[PDB]
Design an enzyme around this catalytic site. Structure first.
Site, short mmCIF file in Angstrom:
data_model
loop_
_atom_site.label_atom_id
_atom_site.label_comp_id
_atom_site.label_asym_id
_atom_site.label_seq_id
_atom_site.Cartn_x
_atom_site.Cartn_y
_atom_site.Cartn_z
N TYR A 104 0.98 -1.22 -0.03
CA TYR A 104 -0.01 0.06 -0.01
C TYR A 104 0.95 1.03 0.12
CZ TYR A 104 -3.49 3.14 1.38
OH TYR A 104 -4.59 4.44 1.27
N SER B 107 -5.86 0.30 -4.35
CA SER B 107 -5.87 1.85 -4.39
C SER B 107 -4.54 2.45 -4.40
CB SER B 107 -6.53 2.01 -3.20
OG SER B 107 -6.82 3.38 -2.98
N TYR B 108 -3.89 3.00 -3.40
CA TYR B 108 -2.54 3.49 -3.30
C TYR B 108 -1.55 2.41 -3.67
CZ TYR B 108 0.96 6.88 -2.43
OH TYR B 108 2.10 7.82 -2.66
N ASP C 84 -16.29 3.48 -9.71
CA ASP C 84 -15.37 4.22 -8.53
C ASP C 84 -15.42 5.67 -8.54
OD1 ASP C 84 -13.45 4.80 -6.83
OD2 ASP C 84 -12.27 2.83 -7.37
N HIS D 209 -14.89 2.06 -5.20
CA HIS D 209 -13.40 1.93 -5.05
C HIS D 209 -13.38 0.47 -4.00
CE1 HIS D 209 -9.29 3.02 -4.63
NE2 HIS D 209 -9.39 3.17 -3.27
C1 LIG Z 1 -10.26 6.14 4.44
C2 LIG Z 1 -9.57 5.14 5.57
C3 LIG Z 1 -8.45 4.60 4.58
C4 LIG Z 1 -10.69 4.22 6.01
O1 LIG Z 1 -8.86 5.90 6.60
C5 LIG Z 1 -9.08 7.28 6.54
C6 LIG Z 1 -7.67 8.12 5.96
C7 LIG Z 1 -7.12 8.98 7.05
O2 LIG Z 1 -6.25 8.64 7.68
N1 LIG Z 1 -7.85 10.36 7.33
C8 LIG Z 1 -8.89 10.63 6.40
C9 LIG Z 1 -9.06 9.87 4.99
N2 LIG Z 1 -7.92 8.97 4.93
C10 LIG Z 1 -7.27 8.64 3.55
O3 LIG Z 1 -6.74 7.81 3.54
C11 LIG Z 1 -7.58 9.49 2.50
C12 LIG Z 1 -7.28 8.94 1.10
N3 LIG Z 1 -8.26 9.40 0.05
C13 LIG Z 1 -7.49 7.30 1.17
C14 LIG Z 1 -7.01 7.09 -0.57
C15 LIG Z 1 -5.83 7.42 -0.96
C16 LIG Z 1 -5.16 7.23 -2.33
F1 LIG Z 1 -4.07 7.33 -2.66
C17 LIG Z 1 -6.23 6.52 -3.03
F2 LIG Z 1 -5.79 6.38 -4.57
C18 LIG Z 1 -7.68 6.39 -2.80
C19 LIG Z 1 -7.95 6.67 -1.50
F3 LIG Z 1 -9.09 6.20 -1.16
#
Ligand SMILES: CC(C)(C)OC[C@@H]1C(=O)NCCN1C(=O)C[C@H](N)Cc1cc(F)c(F)cc1F
Ligand SMILES: CC(C)(C)OC[C@@H]1C(=O)NCCN1C(=O)C[C@H](N)Cc1cc(F)c(F)cc1F
EC number: 3.4.14.5
Lengths: 725, 728
Positions: B509, B592-593, B670, B702
């Site tokens: 990831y 995803s990432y 997605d 997604h």
């Molecule tokens: C949501 C999650 C995992 C459950 O944890 C929350 C976590 C957090 O720590 N704070 C708020 C939001 N968040 C994130 O990770 C936001 C990102 N958009 C997640 C993400 C990154 C990508 F590179 C991608 F391609 C798609 C994708 F969806």
């Protein structure tokens, strides 16, 4: 002794040479030499340069195509070509005055022009811009605006919408000049209430946001576009007042419900013929409308109508055939299905209902090619009773017993499939042979049917093909319910009928289609037999055309049944032929052939090991109305909703556990929308069937872009070779 | 032990982890769902009582998706017709059930198509969002009061967040914040007037003739962002006036100069609310403590109460500036921030004092603050045994920061090294949630002495089933790269023999501030690949991973697709040189990432990997949303960081894919990582004529989490992995 490889087919190593000519008069045609356009005298074969590339190598634009005026005084230059649908496109135009020897820079043709066309004679000019028609009496003078209601995606003047372009007229154009250019008839399509199909277009990587393409597209049972027909006098365009178009209305038997305009043909200088077709495409009416000077109106006498109907299915092959009027316009010949269901040429009279057939037999006239005072030139599959053959015939109009074939005996060993191109008055004609041997182009004289010259014989290609192990072609037939059904086999080189080969069933099997013919082809099947030693076979079962309405109309109102079952039955007999490995039989198809392929793999026959479907139909309620409803009627409970729901591939997802399945589709498919394959994949997921998939970004129904084309056939090759070990 | 952990076992969920999800309703009591019947427990003695029998609503006519009891215990909200929207948003129908009368309401009901509902912290007030507007019901059966009127679909959001704020800022659909006693209702308003729309097809059931086009305001990198406003309305005045006045609280002047965000809302007292704002260049944030002026009925934010949190070597916070934890009087708060050494610890702030004092320190970080009392402050950290992948509960003494005790370290040291906690009302009791490396373990405790009261769930039933199953083992260790510890984990097949050569799958990831190597016990696709297919599933936390200090997390700042990608390749070479890895059978997959990293790895030309799978990957960072991307990559302009945007695309590496077997998977619906991104990957691979495997999933988002698609994707990926590894 190399074999025909996949690189050969993808890189076009061995290319067929054509002789694409355009007739200018009764004895002259233009030909391209890669550096200039030449005028050829049909009688003697000598030529002279008509226009050299050193005339527009300073233009600053890439010349896409040229269009000479009928009088040879102007030429139309096409550039900035931008393809749209199967036929529609957009381009910029520049008229080059052949008399002034320089471009016309005044009152130029606007950019983004949708269609342009000269008059039949002289140098009048009609073009469609922003869905409105314009007429130029002179190339340099201002244009006369004929219509003002033009509106993108709603009102179409002089051009067809999506469904009419694909299904009815097979062209973007909706303009029809009178024989001498006095009148200009046109149609008006209105897609106001037609639901739009929406799909995403991703374009280049630079595009941050994808674009959404929206197209007015009537699916089965949806609201169809309405149509109106007009005729305008181009000899009296007023520079002060707007143009006055005279509207010809459809007969009363067509205004009772939804209908179409399916044919427009001019009889004389003041007589035009229209053919209308009900939305239930088994009833059509031809109107013959004459001009009245004292009233400036067009009248279509009821007594001069002509009904063309069918009780076994739909009228026509894909549309009612076009008429060919006589010199005085008081008679015409046209192809109609006879009493027993075999399409032949019927002699008609403008005034009376009954016509008289001038051809007979258990074969079909493919098309009327030219008409003169004493002869009627047509193409048919009569020779040797082979439905997959094509030959040119001439029937004497004064004695129907004096029929002469003009191509049967020229070279029966190499030539069994013919098309023709006649001169302005049918004084000369070019024969286009395309099989079973290499294509052959000859020039003939109509007065005595003598062969004047050999235009192209592909002798250079014949020499190269002798150093490569090329496959052979076997054309035969099998018996189903005491009926002859023709098939063909692309056989590998050094074919041994005691050895066993893997078999691939190349299928289309659309209504009035034909995959078993005498045409010579250099395609993917060539590589599969030459290099991979695979027997690729095709079979024309119930629903195939050119064999009578008994075979063609067999699938009426029940698409996805007989033509699917017959493919299975044919492959079943192929597996018991001794030279076919019954453990390695595959089936693949494109478009309608993808629907049949998917219906066969979901049939549970157990005959096929694997299969490929490219841009397939999955649910007839998804495809456009003119095509679908022609063979299935309306998807309503009081009509044919049963077969609509019973003939989906999604309802057979369970049976896909027996076979390996490759599903391919382009995301930008405006014809068979990606929705169709998206619903197939979703159904296989619901039942837990594994399969192979592949989308193509921004590709249409053809998947014809250079890089995508090579990619899909490379990907399919691996799938087939992996399924045959 | 004869049967292995089969793919069927994972897809059909044969071996389920037992849970114990409770809801503290008071200081010593909580709710618990036994068998469709809600029980109320007394934490002191474990004795329970029936609060809502299972047959009370089995004749309701609709399937109840979730319940929501009012804090005063007089009503219960019942939501049904649940339809997931985004990660947190959803639409559903609601019904209020009166407990003091044992009847439905049936009068002035919550309208259909309600976007969000919430009770007041105390009492039974109700605030919900319908048609992007906010409504408030003083009594569940009386008519509601409309608070906002500017609500407009896809343009104005009142009480609810748009797509970006829900996903990247608040992690919630709700943009409502009741005051502690319920007097005030603070809400945010988002305006996406000029925010561009992402558009894609949605096909729905096959009965739908024409595909539907989904349109969502989605600001990609550099596009115009939504604007935000903040308001506070007094719900006690709704009865005496026809149109209550919502007082707007503007952002500080240091945020109005350019584009900014509202990244945190936290009440401190009954008349004190703190707002944290963030510039679009996410390295400068400002907390703004605002008090209610009882005289003028306005809200004033004293400049002396501002608190600036910035970063000079990257962005501020992990994913956003942390939230403050105020004391009872609201005159001081504790907050997690990065210290001068780059390690995130707890700092003690005063309302006026600009400077704070750290109460924790060391080469380790605090994961979160859990509870605050007059005596102690409870927090979670990874200090124990210097393991960044461990989680334990600590208790630091407020009167002497040198008195720090760990409350979970030595409970079950061999079985439990990952902990979360759920405290009661005033932190009188707490439930410890152990999740690894052993089977999950739930225990109740009394915070007076931290005494272990009882064992709520020990997964003993699941333990017996795994006895006759050949489960894999897990090795949590580290490697030293450039004089720095980098942790990794391996799911080793049963009867693991270091004298043999095994295939290696690299589960990746590697997102900013993420962690793949930890002590959590899991029953996932990796368990099957190791137990049945004898495949080692490895994960590696390289540069960019969190919970290890800013020098590691900020390494990829403005350089996405570089350090984290190369560290994954180096870890593979490190694993091959360990002795038990077959060099000619090393794969890598990621979601995803991870799909982005996997694609960049497969297109690197390393020659280390034979095949790879990429599920819903990012292709270029100009396709992803602004608040997330810009946080790590800045703006895609020539004057700042456009060069690194264009330099870290997977399309630019399409030629290198001729050396690997590539499987690209993505859901057509997605909304997060748009199908556009995978559509550009394939089109680039076609342009250079490199064959690859593909798979789209119709109408999947997604997560591709629908029961059938979920089983289909892991079945499809299993075949691709087994064939690439020559696995029978
Ligand atoms: C949501 C999650 C995992 C459950 O944890 C929350 C976590 C957090 O720590 N704070 C708020 C939001 N968040 C994130 O990770 C936001 C990102 N958009 C997640 C993400 C990154 C990508 F590179 C991608 F391609 C798609 C994708 F969806
Ligand atoms: C166009 C073609 C082949 C070149 O020949 C013209 C031929 C003709 O004879 N008359 C006019 C139009 N026409 C057709 O075949 C119309 C159909 N839409 C073709 C077609 C059928 C399908 F089932 C399908 F899924 C997709 C699809 F495109």
């Amino acid at each position: 002794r190399k074999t025909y490889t996949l690189t050969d087919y993808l890189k076009n190593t061995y290319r067929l040479k054509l002789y694409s000519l355009r007739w200018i008069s009764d004895h002259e045609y233009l030909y391209k030499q890669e550096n200039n356009i030449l005028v050829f005298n049909a009688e003697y074969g000598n030529s002279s340069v008509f226009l050299e590339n050193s005339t527009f190598d300073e233009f600053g634009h890439s010349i896409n195509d040229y269009s000479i005026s009928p009088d040879g005084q102007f030429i139309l230059l096409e550039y900035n070509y931008v393809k749209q649908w199967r036929h529609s496109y957009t381009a910029s135009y520049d008229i080059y005055d052949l008399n002034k020897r320089q471009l016309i820079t005044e009152e130029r043709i606007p950019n983004n022009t949708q269609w342009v066309t000269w008059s039949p004679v002289g140098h009048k000019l009609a073009y469609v811009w922003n869905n409105d028609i314009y007429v130029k009496i002179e190339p340099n003078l201002p244009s006369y605006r004929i219509t003002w209601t033009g509106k993108e995606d709603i009102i179409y003047n002089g051009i067809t919408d999506w469904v009419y372009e694909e299904e009815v007229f097979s062209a973007y154009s909706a303009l029809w000049w009178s024989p001498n250019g006095t009148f200009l008839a046109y149609a008006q399509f209105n897609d106001t209430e037609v639901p739009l199909i929406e799909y995403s277009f991703y374009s280049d990587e630079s595009l941050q946001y994808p674009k959404t393409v929206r197209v007015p597209y009537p699916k089965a049972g949806a609201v169809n576009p309405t149509v109106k027909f007009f005729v305008v006098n181009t000899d009296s365009l007023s520079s002060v007042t707007n143009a006055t178009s005279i509207q010809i209305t459809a007969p009363a038997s067509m205004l009772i419900g939804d209908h179409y305009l399916c044919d427009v043909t001019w009889a004389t200088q003041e007589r035009i013929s229209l053919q209308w077709l009900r939305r239930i495409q088994n009833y059509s009416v031809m109107d013959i409308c004459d001009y009245d000077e004292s009233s400036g109106r067009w009248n279509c006498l009821v007594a001069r109508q002509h009904i063309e109907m069918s009780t076994t299915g739909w009228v026509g092959r894909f549309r009612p055939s076009e008429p060919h009027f006589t010199l005085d316009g008081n008679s015409f010949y046209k192809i109609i299905s006879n009493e027993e269901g075999y399409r032949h040429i019927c002699y008609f009279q403008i005034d009376k209902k009954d016509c008289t057939f001038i051809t007979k037999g258990t074969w079909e006239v493919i098309g009327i090619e030219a008409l003169t005072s004493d002869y009627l030139y047509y193409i048919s599959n009569e020779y040797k009773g082979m439905p997959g053959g094509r030959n040119l015939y001439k029937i004497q109009l004064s004695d129907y017993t004096k029929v002469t074939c003009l191509s049967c005996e020229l070279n029966p060993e190499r030539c069994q499939y013919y098309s023709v191109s006649f001169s302005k008055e049918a004084k000369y004609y070019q024969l286009r042979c395309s099989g079973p041997g290499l294509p052959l182009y000859t020039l003939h004289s109509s007065v005595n049917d003598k062969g004047l010259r050999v235009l192209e014989d592909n002798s250079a290609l014949d020499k190269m093909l002798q150093n490569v192990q090329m496959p052979s072609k076997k054309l035969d037939f099998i018996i189903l319910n005491e009926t002859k059904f023709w098939y063909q086999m692309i056989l590998p080189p050094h074919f041994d009928k005691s050895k066993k080969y893997p078999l691939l069933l190349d299928v289309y099997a659309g209504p009035c289609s034909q995959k078993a013919d005498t045409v010579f082809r250099l395609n993917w099947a060539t590589y599969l037999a030459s290099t991979e030693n695979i027997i690729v076979a095709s079979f024309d079962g119930r629903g195939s055309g050119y064999q009578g309405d008994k075979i063609m109309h067999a699938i009426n109102r029940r698409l996805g049944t007989f033509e699917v079952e017959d493919q299975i039955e044919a492959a079943r007999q192929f597996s018991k032929m001794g030279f076919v490995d019954n453990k390695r039989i595959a089936i693949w198809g494109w478009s309608y052939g993808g629907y049949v392929t998917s219906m066969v793999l979901g049939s549970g026959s157990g005959v096929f090991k694997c299969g490929i479907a490219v841009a397939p139909v999955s649910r007839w309620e998804y495809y456009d109305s003119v095509y679908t409803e022609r063979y299935m009627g309306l998807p309503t409970p009081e009509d044919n909703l049963d077969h609509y729901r019973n003939s989906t591939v999604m309802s057979r997802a369970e049976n896909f556990k027996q076979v390996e399945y490759l599903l391919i589709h382009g995301t930008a498919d405006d014809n068979v929308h990606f929705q169709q394959s998206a619903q197939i994949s979703k159904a296989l997921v619901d039942v837990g069937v594994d399969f192979q998939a592949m989308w193509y970004t921004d590709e249409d129904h053809g998947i014809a872009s250079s890089t995508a084309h090579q990619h899909i056939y490379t990907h399919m090759s691996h799938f087939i070779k992996q399924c045959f070990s």
